[PDB]
Chains A and B, each alone.
Chain A
C-alpha cells in the first residue's frame, strides 16, 4: 500500500522596480553545510533527499 506523492514547487526571478531578482546558489548570511544539495547555478542536484528546511531553489532579491 506504499504510494509515491510528488509536490511541485514553482519560483521565478521577476525584475522588480528595486533592481532585478536572480536564481543563484550564493546567499550572503547563510551557512556552507545548507548550501550543499545546490550546484554552482543554484538548483539542487537530481535525487538529493530533502529534510523540511532544505533549499530547493537558491533565489536572491535586491
Chain B
C-alpha cells in the first residue's frame, strides 16, 4: 500500500504545490518549466561554476529565448510593503 500510494501522495502534494505554493496562480504544466529551470540552473551552477544565460537556458529547454525571460518574470515571487530597508 506504501509502494501503491506513493503515486497518489506525490501527485496530490505536487498538484497542491503547483497551485497554492505561489501567491499568483501558474498551472502545473507552466510551473514544472520553472521548477526544472531552477533544478537545471542549480545543476549548471554546480557543474560549470558560474550563472548560465537565458540563451543557454533556452538552448537547454529547447525554447525561444524570449519565453525564458517571460517565465522568470512569473518566477519573481512578490515582495512585501512593511519591510525595514
Taking Cβ atoms with an 8 Å cutoff, the residues of A that contact B are: 15-17
Minimum Cβ distance to chain B for residue A13 (Å) = 12
Chain A residues contacting B74 (CB-CB under 8 Å) are: 17
The residues of A that contact B66 with a CB separation of less than 8 Å are: 15
How many chain B residues touch A (Cβ–Cβ < 8 Å)? 5
Q: Is the interface of B mostly helix, strand, loop or mixed?
A: helix
**Is B69 located at the chain interface by the 8 A CB criterion?**
yes
A17 to B70, CA, bound (A): 5
7 contacts between A and B (CB under 8 A): A15-B66, A15-B69, A15-B73, A16-B73, A17-B70, A17-B73, A17-B74
C-alpha gap A17/B73 in the complex (Å): 6
The 5 tightest CB contacts between A and B, nearest first, are: A17-B73, A15-B69, A17-B70, A16-B73, A17-B74
- Give the shortest distance, in Å, between A19 (CB) and chain B (any CB): 10
One digit per residue, 1 when the CB lies within 8 angstroms of any chain A CB and 0 when it does not, for chain B 55-85 equals 0000000000010011001100000000000
Q: Separation in Å of the A15 CB from the closest CB of chain B?
A: 5
Query: Which chain A residue has the least Cβ–Cβ distance from B69?
Result: A15
Residues of the B chain whose Cβ atoms lie less than 8 Å from the Cβ of A17: 70, 73-74
Contacts of A15 in B (CB 8 A): 66, 69, 73
Interface residues as binary, B36-70 with A (CB distance below 8 Å gives 1, 0 otherwise): 00000000000000000000000000000010011
**How many whole Å from A14's CB to the nearest CB in chain B?**
9
